[PDB]
Structure 1
Amino acid sequence: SSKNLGGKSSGRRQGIKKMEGHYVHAGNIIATQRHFRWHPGAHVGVGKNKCLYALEEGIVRYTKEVYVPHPRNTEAVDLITRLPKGAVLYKTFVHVVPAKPEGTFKLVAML
Structure 2
Amino acid sequence: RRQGIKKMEGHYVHAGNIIATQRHFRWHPGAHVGVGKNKCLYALEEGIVRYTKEVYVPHPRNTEAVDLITRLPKGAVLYKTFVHVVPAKPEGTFKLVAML
TM-score range, shorter chain: over 0.9
Which stretches of structure 1, 4 residues or more, deviate above 6 A after TM superposition?
A: none
Between Structure 1 and Structure 2, how many residues are aligned?
100
Tell me the distance in 1 between the aligned counterparts of 2:44 and 2:37: 15
Tell me the distance in 2 between the aligned counterparts of 1:13 and 1:98: 28
Describe how 1:1-111 pairs up with structure 2 within 5 A. Answer: 12-111=1-100
Tell me the distance in 1 between the aligned counterparts of 2:22 and 2:97: 48
Quote how far apart the aligned CAs of 1:14 are.
0.2
Percent identical residues: 100
TM-score, structure 1 normalization: 0.90
Quote how far apart the aligned CAs of 1:67 are.
0.3
Tell me the distance in 1 between the aligned counterparts of 2:54 and 2:2: 27
Tell me the distance in 1 between the aligned counterparts of 2:99 and 2:65: 60
Tell me the distance in 1 between the aligned counterparts of 2:86 and 2:36: 20
Quote how far apart the aligned CAs of 1:22 are.
0.1
TM-score, structure 2 normalization: 0.99
Once the two structures are superposed, what CA deviation does each residue of 1:3-50 show, in whole Å capped at 9, x if it has no partner? xxxxxxxxx000000001000000000000000000000000000100
User: In structure 2, the residue corresponding to 1:105 is in which secondary structure?
Assistant: strand
Tell me the distance in 2 between the aligned counterparts of 1:64 and 1:106: 40
Once the two structures are superposed, what CA deviation does each residue of 1:31-83 show, in whole Å capped at 9, x if it has no partner? 00000000000000000100000000000000000000001100000000001
Quote how far apart the aligned CAs of 1:92 are.
0.1
Q: List runs of 5+ in structure 1 lacking aligned partners.
A: 1-11
